């Protein structure tokens, strides 16, 4: 967790150690008391509300990614299809 808003991530690699790879995810955040256009994860996060349901973790434990799946709840109406809704 950096202190400024600027970081200079590098990677050194020798000719032999060329296959070495990484993949990161940098996320902007502000102080605790968030507002509109900002979602609040705890421990000093004000990630953008676009980052909620982004499909990626933009925090700690996946808090931005929850209650974001809604399909259907039914009984025999769930199976009006090639299941027993034909029979």
């Amino acid at each position: 967790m950096l202190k400024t808003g600027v970081g200079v991530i590098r990677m050194w690699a020798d000719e032999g150690s060329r296959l070495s790879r990484f993949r990161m995810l940098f996320t902007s955040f502000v102080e605790p008391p968030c507002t509109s256009s900002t979602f609040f994860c705890h421990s000093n996060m004000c990630i953008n509300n676009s980052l909620v349901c982004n499909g990626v973790q933009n925090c700690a434990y996946p808090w931005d990614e929850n209650h974001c799946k809604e399909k259907k709840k039914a009984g025999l109406f769930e199976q009006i299809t090639k299941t027993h809704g034909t029979i």
Partner: protein
Amino acid sequence: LNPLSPDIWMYVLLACLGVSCVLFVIARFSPYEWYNPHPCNPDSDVVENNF
């Protein structure tokens, strides 16, 4: 109402409507179900069906 799935509760309820229509057709079609009522007066062509 849970120990049978809600397609079985529909298949049972369609079976009661199924078999009772099958039983009513066969009872009117079968010539042995048409018994003769009035055993006190056993001479009349008034054979009945209770189904």
